[model samples]
Target: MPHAFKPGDLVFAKMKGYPHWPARIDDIADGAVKPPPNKYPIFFFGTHETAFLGPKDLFPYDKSKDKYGKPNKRKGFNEGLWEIQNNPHASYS
Candidate 1:
């Protein structure tokens, strides 16, 4: 299945290893988001696990750790991992 997303839409991506580290979709590029090429656009959010969505059927979270931390290779649980697009109707245009 394909990932469902739209411009100006708010989406969440699980942190690399941190299950609680939520991310937002800042931009959706018409290309691959991670290593190796894929057949879908990539979602960009922020640093760490702050951006991008994973393969379909995979939730964005760290099963091993409920929270984010250095040992988990996360930027930091307190760090800004996600962005809130409060104004869903507000557009750059």
Candidate 2:
């Protein structure tokens, strides 16, 4: 069966270990989920460090600003990807 999700769709996934903690579908893989992965699109929470690959690993947040008044800019690939790739620790700290 094909994975049900789109580019901008909000989805929830369960984590492999941390079942109690859910994450949001930051991205999606394009091809089959098998050996020698093909087009395995990654998902992240503002970056690739925090991705949702397994169960209990995804939960959608509001598209708009949160209670803290922080807006989800949904930064572009060039800007977001480049930053995360260069500064690996930036995601956590």
**Per-residue C-alpha lDDT of model 2 across residues 24-82, encoded as one tens digit per residue:** 33333366343223322234334444442532333343322132122334443334434
Listed in order, each prediction's TM-score against the native is 0.33, 0.27
Candidate 1 backbone overlaps, count: 4
Residue pairs with clashing backbones, model 1:
14-60, 18-62, 19-61, 19-62
Please count the clashing residue pairs in each candidate, in the order shown. Answer: 4, 14
lDDT of each: 0.36, 0.34
The stretch of ten residues in a row with the least summed lDDT in candidate 2 is: 63-72
Candidate 1 per-residue lDDT, tens place, 1-93, comes to 434543443333443444443333344436834433332223333343323344452333333123332233445433333222233232222
Q: Which 10 residues in a row give candidate 1 its minimum summed lDDT?
A: 83-92
